[PDB]
Design a protein around this ligand. Structure first.
Ligand code: HEC
Ligand code: HEC
Ligand SMILES: [Zn+2]
Ligand SMILES: [Zn+2]
Lengths: 136, 136
């Protein structure tokens, strides 16, 4: 029933990045520089193949500092994790949703079985609940 | 004599990212969202080892569009490449410096054998000419 902490995700494929700045509707709690990572199984799904059980996507969210017309990464705020298990996470579209505060395995954030996460991700049903697109 | 195009660099380790906004001293030509990638050999140097011959670092630069105070990755502008070969690149401190317009192998940007690149990177001689630091 629990999403595994995605040990070693910093060695995984970098899918894409985005910066959410003050004034954006999602500044709270998604504000900062985020990086999306995918393990090999998730890469199969992002390429237009199917997502095998065991696919993991990670949303890696950093605070940032303004430094003379540069935005510089600061401390990690949190990670979001989607873990594919069609049977075990069938209540939330076959993905398990978990958050880890400061990316620490000891700071699990999700309290409602990931119904809140899935409420937003459900909009992407046609791409298996994944917003991110693979780019070059 | 020429830096090899780093084929498959998008599958390499994501070191870090930074945004260089308009007004930054380096807006021309490095403005945009950049991601730094390291092959296995370059990771040896970033961890505190000597950079071995064959280490490659890539500066992957994207334009961005500001949309409701989100910075959204646009088209790739260029990649910058540092290729370690203590002997073949001795004139520029044992790194060969190249750029590829739009990340395309036939769009070589460096016209001065990398003396301008080396002139700035020489500030980091004590870190073997590399600015980026490994983060977790
Ligand atoms: C809308 C308000 C969302 C809620 C609530 C949650 N997420 Fe989300 N997520 C959202 C967007 C718009 C994106 C794409 C970001 C980008 O750069 O394009 C994401 C992405 C993720 C990812 C990466 C995979 C993907 O779908 O692109 C993960 C791993 C992820 N989100 C997890 C996640 C979790 C665990 C949430 C509840 C704690 C959660 N998200 C909520 C939009 C929204
Ligand atoms: C100072 C005026 C610079 C010039 C000219 C060039 N580079 Fe550079 N480079 C600079 C900085 C401050 C950084 C770090 C960015 C960060 O996010 O911290 C970089 C980075 C690179 C990298 C990545 C490895 C590293 O040293 O951090 C590469 C591969 C790189 N630069 C290549 C490069 C090339 C090919 C240049 C001439 C075309 C070049 N740089 C010029 C600063 C400066
Ligand atoms: Zn200014
Ligand atoms: Zn703005």
């Amino acid at each position: 029933t629990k999403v595994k902490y995605p040990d070693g995700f910093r060695s995984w494929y970098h899918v894409k990045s985005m910066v959410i700045q003050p004034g954006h509707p999602l500044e709270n709690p998604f504000g900062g520089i985020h990086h999306v990572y995918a393990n090999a199984e998730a890469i199969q799904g992002l390429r237009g193949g199917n997502y095998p059980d065991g696919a993991v996507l990670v949303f890696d969210l950093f605070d940032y500092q303004e430094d003379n017309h540069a935005l510089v990464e600061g401390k990690r705020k949190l990670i979001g994790v989607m873990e594919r298990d069609a049977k075990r996470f069938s209540a939330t579209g076959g993905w398990g949703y978990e958050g880890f505060g400061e990316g620490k395995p000891d700071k699990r954030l999700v309290t409602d079985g990931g119904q809140g996460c899935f409420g937003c991700h459900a909009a992407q049903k046609e791409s298996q609940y994944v917003f991110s697109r693979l780019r070059d």
